[PDB]
């Protein structure tokens, strides 16, 4: 029996940038008072996690990464009323305290408590619930999933539906919610329009099923990687496009494909460049383009705001603009309820001791998702 | 006494930048197919107008600048159904055909006619209906209204009420109209919300006024000179602040005055670095920044994505997002039935033979809107 008790388990540590995990065991201490233990059943690969290996992210290390996840309370601190010891819940990574002026706004998500705009590696009370030869072990973003066992504050987990499959499920808690989100709530695509999807990563395909589900007539595929057609036209994608292909830049091959520019575009890969595509390619007096990609910390981009004066919407958006402890256990429920597909974005099934492996994969293009099973 | 022939008469000539503008005699062409000659009766003078002398705002020269103007329509060419002579009309700087996929698109208003985003200078056909001294002169925005007589094509003029005073509503073709519509329609200010306006000439104030007529509860003027927050707080700002008073920058300042960022932030000024600032200072999560101000040529700003990435939406809009055509007439019954003001705007008047004395009231700060009177 673990509850009350510190657990040694394994997990991968991340010592320093640019160097493979370390999967070795670490001590997890208890929750304390409105904290949650979770045993992982299955952590997704996301290259949001990449970013904090190639330093694109600046986070402290050393770390526990891991952000897109789902597992079973193994146990939970004193005050917690929102889980108890059994259930399927998926950490959040963006927190929902309920009680911050974002929180109880109609159209906010970024709740205040949140550990991206200046992490801390950190727990809500600023200390770790985790030890590496004998050295504290930071956090990532309120999760840490790439463990055996992590611990969460209560803000940073949902309960979701007892009778989940958890190999699949885990994606809504990053990647399928980020993308399908970006489309429908934070761009709202209307029926009808003309959509572009910059990256075809499992982020980009998400944002493809949410422009397919808001009944878009028209998705072109943007990315310099022809293998990612393919599924993103199973997916929904009517046209793919690669820039190496074009003497023009794209932004004007997609304005002349779109008779004027898009009604929707989206930046989903973490590029400066690939931002301002996007925004250009979008129409100049009624566009609407969404950053949804991280790009390289502290790079500023460049652009003239005359593509703004005309009338374009630019806009981003963390995990979709959805209020992710409301919002997570609704998107499983509608999973259960057959109203989106999850598979397409799973390439890959590894177990967690192969998690260097899965980011080999992703590194070298052929993956989407990789689902790692502890 | 003068339809279908060539009208002589005085216009304010620019013949090179940051020089006088030269009031003397021009040949004004009768309308062509689809043309309106309008006798000017009122016409203010907008910062846009002083960008064109600056060369902040590039366009051909020699010109006939004026753009916020209303008249009496002299003569119709062939075709025209929308007017008739004696009608008094506002001549529209954006146009509104009616057939392009903006004009059909329920939120667009930056007609595809316009002449703003590659100035030629030129009515719809190319050609000049402008001499003097035996020189064609361009045009500016299709409308040229520093002159007794214009030409305008159809689609840039609009029919209003024939008790219309023309001194007061000439301030719907540009100023009124495009800070109070930034406000109601492209920002869409909510109750109880907390604005910030950068910049106190006539069209902040215009935003200050929607955004008062909106049901804002905090309303921040931002000036650089103290001399226009009198006027500011008469048409609804709470509170006043001049970044020049302040060791910090002012996005900090205005994010600590609204316990963590504004809801809607306005640029009314035309600089690049309050552009940044003015998105810097709405909530991050949930803020809305719209750019009013006219960029200097070709020139680019840097940002942070990360400023869009945590949920801030940035746009900008021509003429306060308003389909000119439909909505000149309706903001002109409006004045009429007393549903805003004008004469907040208005601090001199002067005849149009004094239109460089107006010029000198607004680049010293002294003035709001002068109206000149031909
Ligand atoms: N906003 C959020 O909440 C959020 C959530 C999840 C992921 N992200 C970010 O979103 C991005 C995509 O994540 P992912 O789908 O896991 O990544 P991914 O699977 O690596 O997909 C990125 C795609 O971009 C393609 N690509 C690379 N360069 C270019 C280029 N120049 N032009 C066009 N295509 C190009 C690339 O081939 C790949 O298919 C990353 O920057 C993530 O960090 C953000
Ligand atoms: N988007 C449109 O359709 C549209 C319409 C009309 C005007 N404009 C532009 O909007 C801007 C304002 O026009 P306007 O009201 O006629 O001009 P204005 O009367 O010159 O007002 C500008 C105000 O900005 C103030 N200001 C200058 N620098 C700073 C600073 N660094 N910080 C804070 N305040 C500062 C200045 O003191 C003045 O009161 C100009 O750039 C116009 O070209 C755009
Ligand atoms: O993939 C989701 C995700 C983000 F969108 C970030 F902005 C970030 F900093 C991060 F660490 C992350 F995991
Ligand atoms: O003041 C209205 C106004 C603008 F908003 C512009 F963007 C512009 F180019 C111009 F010439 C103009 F007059
Ligand atoms: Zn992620
Ligand atoms: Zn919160
Ligand atoms: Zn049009
Ligand atoms: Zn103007």
């Keep these: 029996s673990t509850a009350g008790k510190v657990i040694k388990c394994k997990a991968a540590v991340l010592w320093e940038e640019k160097k493979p995990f370390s999967i ?21 690969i996301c290259r949001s996690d990449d970013h904090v290996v190639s330093g694109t ?19 939970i601190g004193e005050g917690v009323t929102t889980v108890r010891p059994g259930d399927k819940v998926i ?8 009680k911050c002026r974002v929180c109880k706004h109609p159209e906010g998500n970024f709740c205040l408590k949140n550990d991206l705009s200046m992490p801390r590696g950190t727990m809500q009370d600023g200390t770790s619930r985790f030890t590496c030869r004998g050295k504290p072990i930071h956090h990532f973003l309120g999760t840490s999933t790439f463990s055996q ?6 803000i940073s987990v949902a ?10 499920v885990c994606l809504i808690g990053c990647g399928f919610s980020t993308g399908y989100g970006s489309a429908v709530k934070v761009a709202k695509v209307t029926q009808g329009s003309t959509c572009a999807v910059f990256g075809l990563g499992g982020v980009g395909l998400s944002v493809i ?8 007539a028209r998705i072109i595929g943007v990315d310099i990687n022809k293998d990612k057609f393919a599924k993103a036209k199973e997916v929904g994608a009517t046209e793919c496009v690669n ?21 929707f575009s989206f930046e989903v890969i973490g590029r400066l460049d690939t931002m301002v595509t996007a925004l250009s390619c979008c129409q100049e007096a009624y566009g609407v383009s969404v950053i949804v990609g991280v790009p390289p910390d502290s790079q500023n981009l460049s652009m003239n705001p005359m593509l703004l004066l005309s009338g374009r919407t630019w806009k981003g958006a963390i995990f979709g603009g959805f209020k992710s402890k409301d919002s997570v256990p609704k998107l499983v429920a509608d999973f259960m309820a057959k109203k989106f597909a999850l598979d397409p974005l799973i ?19 052929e993956s989407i998702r990789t689902i790692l099973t502890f």
Excluded: W
């Design 243 to 263: 820039p190496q292909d074009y003497k023009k830049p794209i932004q004007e091959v997609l304005t002349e494909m779109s008779n004027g520019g898009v009604d």
């Design 57 to 75: 992210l600046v986070t402290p290390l050393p770390v526990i990464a891991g952000h897109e996840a789902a597992g079973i309370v193994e146990s």
């Design 159 to 168: 309960k979701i539906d007892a009778a989940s499959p958890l190999e699949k």
């Design 91 to 98: 950490p959040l990574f963006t927190p929902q305290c309920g």
């Design 24 to 44: 070795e065991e670490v001590e997890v201490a208890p929750p304390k008072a409105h904290e949650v233990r979770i045993k992982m059943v299955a952590t997704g």
């Design 149 to 154: 066992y992590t611990v969460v504050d209560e």
């Design 347 to 365: 390439t890959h099934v590894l177990p967690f001791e192969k998690i260097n492996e899965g980011f080999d994969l992703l590194r070298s293009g």
């Design 209 to 216: 099923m949410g422009c397919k589900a808001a009944g878009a």
